[PDB]
RNA sequence: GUUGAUUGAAGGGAUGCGAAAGUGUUCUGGAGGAUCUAAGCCGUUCUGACGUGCAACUCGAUGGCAUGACAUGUGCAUAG
RNA sequence: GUUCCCUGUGGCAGGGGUGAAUCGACUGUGGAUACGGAGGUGCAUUGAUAGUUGUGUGUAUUGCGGCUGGGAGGCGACUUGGCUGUGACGGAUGGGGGCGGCCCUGUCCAGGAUAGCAGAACUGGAUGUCUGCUGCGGAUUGUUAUGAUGCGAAGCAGCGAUGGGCGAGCCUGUUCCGAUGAAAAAGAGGCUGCUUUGUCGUACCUAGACCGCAUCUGGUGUCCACUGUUUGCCGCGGAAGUGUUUUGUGCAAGGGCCGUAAGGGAAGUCGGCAAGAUUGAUGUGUAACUUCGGGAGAAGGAUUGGCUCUAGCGUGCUAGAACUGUUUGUUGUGGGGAAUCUGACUGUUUACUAAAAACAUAGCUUUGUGUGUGGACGCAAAGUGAAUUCUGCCCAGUGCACUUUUAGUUACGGCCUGUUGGGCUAAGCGAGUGUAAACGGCGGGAGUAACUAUGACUCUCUUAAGGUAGCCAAAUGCCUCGUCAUGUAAUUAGUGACGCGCAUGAAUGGAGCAACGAGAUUCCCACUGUCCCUACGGCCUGUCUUGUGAACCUACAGCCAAGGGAACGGGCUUGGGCUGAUCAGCGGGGAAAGAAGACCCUGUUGAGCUUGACUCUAGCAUGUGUGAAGUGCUGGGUGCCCAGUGCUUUGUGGAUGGAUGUGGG
RNA sequence: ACGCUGCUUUUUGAUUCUUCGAUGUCGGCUCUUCCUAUCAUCGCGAAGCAGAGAUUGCGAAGUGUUGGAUUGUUCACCCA
RNA sequence: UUGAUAGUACGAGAGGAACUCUUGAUUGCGACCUCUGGUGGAGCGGCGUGCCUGCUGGCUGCUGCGGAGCUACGUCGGGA
RNA sequence: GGAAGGUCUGAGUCCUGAGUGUUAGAUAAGAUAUAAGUCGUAACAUGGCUGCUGUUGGAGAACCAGCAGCAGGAUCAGUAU
C-alpha cells in the first residue's frame, strides 16, 4: 500500500502536503458504508451533499455534507431526547 | 472612460436571472399530522428540501438533520417538541436550537434557512410576550411569542471542511450560483475601465477606503465605509 | 464527436513473522484537471519557401496539445 | 437555380422531364428542416422521377353499418373481449451476448491464366437460454470484481421473458459531482362489411455547379467505405470505384528541394543556428534529493534473422535447445548528464512581426450588508497568489469610521421684535477619539580597548518613527571589466564567498526549488560538411521551340579626369577616349523604384488618458413649501407659538416646487 | 628644460550653406584599389660600434603583415 | 631554412660572426590525371516489404563493392 | 582436429560502479592558554528582586519575564467561640 498517504494517493505530488491531508480526512468518511437503522444492513451511501440512502429498502434520510451526522447535530438531538424522558 | 465591471454584472442579471424556489410553510392553527414524502437536491442551494403533505395542503421546507421519508410530523400552535414539528415559539425551552423562524405570524420563514444553521432561544420575557433569540450572524432580536419555528438544525453540515483545491471546481460552483469567475484584478487593467488603472508598476496609487455617504455612485469601489483595516 | 496503448490509488483475497502491539511478501481491482499515440486541432524554430504570390496571411519541414476551465451545427438574449 | 434528357447544329437553337395515407414540413412546448410525435417492407419498371409509378404482402386512419359480452379459471406468480399507463432524459468504466462485414474449415458446382515442374495450386458461388417472480423447503451460497441470506440460502416444481472466431445497438454491475443531468401535446379497448385519406417541397451539383471579383494550392455541418505487415482505423505497399494524353528540348553559369565524403572534431558563430545522433520490444541495473506521493523509461550495460524440434495450458501465447550464412537482422517510433535565475502545478493571450517571467488558478487576508425570487456555511466589493517558515517599528500628513448629551462657522421658508434691522429653528466643515494584509514612511555628528586598526562603551543634534528578521555587484550597484577563490594555454562570460546596499527588505509581500516548463543562462559526454576547404552526383527550374500574352516606370537622355558652381555633374570650361546595330550573365553608378518624413521644430490645428487646472453637472445628503380628518400626552419662552407624541377610521404613498453641502462618476 | 614657428584632416568641438512630396542609420563577414608619416625583407651612414645582440638616420611602397579565449561592440586585454 | 665556412676572425675570459658553395620547405600564380584518396540514379552481387497461384523469372525498398569522366587530400614548372 | 578451426585455464588493456583511508580550499563558527586591557555587576549574607530545574518569548553583555515544580530555604511549630 502506501505508508502515510492513503486515499489521497490519487493526487500525485500536486497542491501541497497540508492540503492533501485535508482531502484525506474528509474523503474517508464520505466514501464509507454505514449500517441502516430500519433494516440493519450495511448499505448506506451518500447521494449528494446532505442526502444518504440505503440500497436495500430504499429509505432516504438527511445528514451532513461529508459525514452522516455532524457534531452540532448530535448535541441538539440529545437535548430533545432528554427533555421528553424527564 | 467606459463603464466598470461591477455595473455591467448587475445589468446582466436582470436580463437572465438566478432563481430559487422560496421555501415556506402554511397556516394551520389546529394540530394536524404531516408526512415527509420526499427529500431532494436543488440547483443553486446547498441544503436539501423536504416535501411534506398535510390533509389538504403540501409545502416545501428546509429539511432538518434527522428526517427520513415516511416520517410523521405535527403542525399547529400547541404541538409537542421533536425534530420537525412546526410549533409556536413559546413552547420551546431556553437553549434550544430552531430554524426557519418567522417574524409576523404567518409569513412562513425568515431566519436561519441555509446549509447547517440555526437560531438560539435565550429568554422568555413572559410579560409583554417577548422572546429574545440569537440569529445566525450574532445579532440579538426580540420577536413576539406567537411566531412559529421548526425544531432542530438545518441539514447539510460543514460544506467548507473540504477545500475546492482546483480551478475546475470553482468553475462549476460559479456556473450554478452566479459569482464572477474568473476575476481579473483591477490593477492589471488599463485606466479606461477601472479606477485602479495603468502605471509603469502595478499599484493602486491612493487610499482604498472610500466613503459610503455622499460621493458619486460609480466611485464606490474597494473597501466601502470601512471602520478598520488590518490583520488583527 | 473522441482510436490503440502506458502507469497502477482506495477497497478485497491468500501467505510469512511476532508473547502481544503490530508488520513483510504477493495476487485481485481500476482512481487521477496522471504519460504517449490516432481521428484531428493549434502555431515554437528554420529569422526555410513566397514576397506585381496559388493567397489583401498561403506552402514545406520541425515542434506543441489531443476526457477537457474541450471542439462543433442550429433557436434565443447583449449595439456605439 | 435548369447547370438535368433528347434532337439539330459551330456554343448556341428547338422540344421534353420533378406523380406520396405509410418521406419532411403545415401540429408540441415563453423557441426548432437534428429535441417530442397516428402509419412498411420486398420485387420489377424510364432517354430523364421514384419509401411517390406498377405489383406481392402488411399497418394506421375518415365515415357508415351488422353481430356480440359485463364473467370464467389458477393455493399462488398469472391466463383471458375484462382501462388510467407512458411521454421523460448526465459522464467514465468492467462482465455477458452480437446487425453487417472479414477470416479459417468439410462438401458440391463453375472461372481465368500458363515454356517445364508442383499431394492435386489460385479465384468466385452455393450449402454445414435465465435478470426476475411464486409455491414447497428450512441453512447455507456465489462473482472477472464489490457479495447475497431467519425481513427466509441452496435444492425440487412452476410462471413469465427471450461448422469455428474476431463486435455495433441490446442485457446486467460498479463508480464520479459545493455540477445530480428540459418542457408540453398525445389512452382507451372484441369479431366482422363497405367507404375516405387535404396543402406545399421532390430534376440536377463537395467542390471546375457554394463563399473568397476567377476553372483561385485557402475556407465549408453530418453519415458509409475492403486488404498484407503491425499494440496501432498511423506509417510503408495493394483492390473497388473514379480521373487522364498520344509530333517542344535533354539538360552552361546561378537558383529551389535532396544524397555521399579522406584526416581532424565547434578551431565556425552574438549564440551548436542547421544537420548528424538516440529511438520498438524483452532480461539486467538504477543516485542526489524529496511535500514520502515521487525523482524513474533516472543514468549504465546486454539480447534480437532463417530453419528443424522440445516443454507448459489458457491453444495461441510464453519458456528452452540443435543446426545454418561472406558478421548480420527493429528494412518505423525518446539524445543524455551537472548547475544558476524565474513562474508553484493542468490551463489563457496581442485573427495578420511579441506564447512570455504577462493573465487566470487553488490557498491566505481585509471590507459592507437582517433582505432581493434568494434569509449570513448567504449575497456583493477589493488586495496577495500552492505547501513549508515568517510577516518587525510609525496614526505627524492624506483617506475612512464614530462622537459632538459641555467652543466656533453656516441657506431657503416660518415665527419673534423693531425702524428695515436684529433674535430662534439643518446637514456639512471645524474639533475630539480609533484604524497600516488603508495610501504610504522607516536620521546625522563627535570622542573612546597598553603596535597600528576598529569601536562593545559615552556625549550630542534630531524624528510620527529612524530599516528589524533575512538577502545581495542578484532580471535591483552609479563608480565598475568592484575585491579574493575556482573552471581555461589564455575568462568584460559562469559559479562560490565578502558588504556603509548611488537606489535591497517583509500579503508594495521576505526567505525558500520537491514536482512541472517549445521560459532565460553556463559547462560535460556523445555526435557531426558549423568550419579547416571544398569536391562529385540526383530531380525541378534557368538555357532552346510553339501557343496565350501583362505590369512598374518614363523632362530630355545615357563614357571618363580636373575645375568652378546651391561647397559630391550625363549636359557647362580645359583635357582623355572604347566601339558601327548580337546573345547570355551581373549587382559599381543612375544621390534607382515604392510613400505630400512616423523622428525633430512651427500652427493662437486635433484626439485618447490623468488630476491638487478653470467653469459647470447626473446622482446622493439635509432643512423647508404642497398633501387628511378628529383627538390625548410630555416639554420650551412670553395668553402665546413649537417639539416628540399615542390613539380613532373616514385621505393615502404614487409624488411634486425651491434651498444649502457633496460630486474627475 | 624655460620659450618660440609650422603641417595634416584619422579625434572631439564650433557653425547651419545643401537634402524633411525620405539619399536605408553601428559592427562583423566577403572583395577590390589607393596613400607613406616604412613594421619586416633589399641597399647604405653614425656611435659612449671589440665580437654577438640591439639603438639612431637616409634611399625605397615591389611583395608580405597569421591562428585563438572573454565582450554586440570600434576599442581593450591576455595566450600561441 | 640544413650542412660546410668555424668553435675560426674578434676577445684577458665568458662568449662568438661574414662573403662564396650547399639542403629542404611555406605561401602565391599557371597547368595536368601516371599513382593514391573522394564521388560515381553506369554495371554486378547480398538481404528484405507488397503484388504476379508456388519454384524459376520479374517489378518495387535498404545495403557492399564500384570502371570511365570530373576533382585535391595527389603530381609537375621561373631573366644573371 | 588432416587442416581451417573448436574447447579449458587465463594474465593484461579499456571502461563504469560500491568501499575504506589520507589530504588541499577563499570564507568562517568554536574551544583553550595569555596579556593589558574596556563595559557593567549575574552568583556567594534575605548578596541588596531568596536560589535552582524544565519549557516558551525577549534584550550590548552578564542575564530578564511569564506558567508549573523542588529545598540543596530565610519556616521541622502556635490555641476553633
Ligand atoms: Zn435499510
Swiss-Prot record, chain B:
It comes from the Eukaryota. GO terms for cellular component: cytosolic large ribosomal subunit. One of its GO terms (molecular function) is rRNA binding. GO terms for biological process: cytoplasmic translation. Pfam families: Ribosomal_L2_C. Keywords: Cytoplasm, Ribonucleoprotein, Ribosomal protein, RNA-binding, rRNA-binding. The keyword Metal-binding does not apply. This is Large ribosomal subunit protein uL2. It comes from Encephalitozoon cuniculi (strain GB-M1) (Microsporidian parasite).
Amino acid at each position: 500500500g502506501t505508508k502515510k498517504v492513503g486515499i489521497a494517493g490519487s493526487f500525485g505530488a500536486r497542491y501541497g502536503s497540508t492540503l492533501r491531508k485535508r482531502m484525506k480526512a474528509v474523503l474517508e468518511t464520505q466514501r464509507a458504508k454505514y449500517i441502516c437503522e430500519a433494516c440493519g444492513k450495511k448499505t448506506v451511501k451518500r447521494e449528494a451533499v446532505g442526502i444518504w440512502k440505503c440500497r436495500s429498502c430504499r429509505r432516504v434520510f438527511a445528514g451532513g455534507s461529508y459525514a452522516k451526522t455532524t457534531p452540532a447535530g448530535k448535541i441538539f438531538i440529545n437535548m430533545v431526547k432528554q427533555y421528553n424522558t424527564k | 472612460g467606459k463603464i466598470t465591471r461591477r455595473t455591467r454584472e448587475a445589468k446582466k442579471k436582470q436580463r437572465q436571472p438566478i432563481v430559487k424556489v422560496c421555501l415556506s410553510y402554511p397556516i394551520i392553527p389546529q394540530v394536524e399530522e404531516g408526512e415527509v414524502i420526499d427529500i431532494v437536491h436543488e440547483r443553486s442551494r446547498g441544503a436539501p428540501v423536504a416535501i411534506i403533505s398535510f390533509k389538504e395542503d403540501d409545502c416545501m421546507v428546509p429539511a432538518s438533520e434527522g428526517m427520513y421519508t415516511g416520517q410523521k410530523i405535527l403542525i399547529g400552535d400547541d404541538a409537542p417538541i421533536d425534530i420537525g414539528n412546526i410549533t409556536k415559539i413559546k413552547n420551546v425551552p431556553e437553549g434550544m436550537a430552531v430554524n426557519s423562524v418567522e417574524s409576523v405570524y404567518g409569513d412562513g420563514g425568515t431566519f436561519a434557512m441555509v446549509n447547517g444553521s440555526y437560531s438560539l432561544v435565550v429568554n422568555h420575557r413572559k410579560e409583554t410576550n417577548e422572546t429574545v433569540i440569537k440569529i445566525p450572524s450574532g445579532k440579538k432580536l426580540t420577536v413576539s411569542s406567537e411566531c412559529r419555528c421548526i425544531v432542530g438544525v438545518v441539514a447539510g453540515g460543514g460544506i467548507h471542511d473540504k477545500p475546492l483545491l482546483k480551478a475546475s471546481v470553482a468553475h462549476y460552483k460559479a456556473k450554478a450560483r452566479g459569482h464572477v469567475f474568473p476575476r481579473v484584478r483591477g490593477v492589471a487593467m488599463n485606466p479606461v475601465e477601472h479606477i485602479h488603472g495603468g502605471g509603469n508598476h502595478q499599484h493602486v496609487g491612493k487610499p482604498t477606503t472610500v466613503s459610503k455617504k455622499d460621493i458619486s455612485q460609480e466611485q464606490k469601489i474597494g473597501l466601502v465605509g470601512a471602520r478598520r483595516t488590518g490583520y488583527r
